[PDB]
Design a protein around this nucleic acid. Structure first.
Length: 105
DNA sequence: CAAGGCACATGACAACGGTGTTCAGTGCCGCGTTGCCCGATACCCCCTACCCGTAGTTGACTGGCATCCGGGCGCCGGGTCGCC
């Protein structure tokens, strides 16, 4: 990386290649706005529906939880949880609570 | 002419009429919370073409590789040699 870069002075091949680990502020703030808007639309729905979808898709922890995995803290059945998840997906699929999330993809 | 005797109706007397109520029970027929029964997918098993580490190869075969310049200036600073 300390090669002359073909230039006798003031240059180094080590100062011409961009990295990839660096966080792009644009993408980061877009993600933050996505998180806030999704949390807002999530609060718009019922608090119970909100909580169950959040725990299923893991919106507070990195790893999502399985259906029956939610039926221990909340004390519900593996098929009840599936049913409320299904009707949550049905409601969120409504064009009402989709537009604000369309551009986010 | 006054008193005593018989009709019809009359102050109460309950019990039917008929309807809408008090409990009360149990459903009737609309909305909800959890039983099925499976089906798939993560976790053990064996071996094997290849990757990676180590062991030898008995004519002899005994000192490399250098650098090499047109700064240029200028100073500091000390070391080495000279003076004596």
């Amino acid at each position: 990386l300390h090669t002359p870069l073909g230039e006798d002075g003031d240059s180094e091949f080590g100062d011409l290649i961009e990295d990839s680990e660096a966080v792009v502020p644009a993408d980061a703030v877009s993600f933050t706005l996505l998180q806030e808007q999704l949390h807002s639309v999530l609060d718009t729905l019922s608090e119970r529906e909100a909580g169950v979808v959040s725990m299923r898709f893991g919106l507070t922890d990195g790893q999502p939880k399985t259906l029956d995995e939610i039926g221990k803290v909340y004390g519900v059945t593996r098929e009840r949880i599936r049913q409320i998840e299904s009707k949550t997906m049905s409601k969120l699929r409504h064009p009402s609570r989709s537009q604000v999330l369309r551009d986010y993809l």
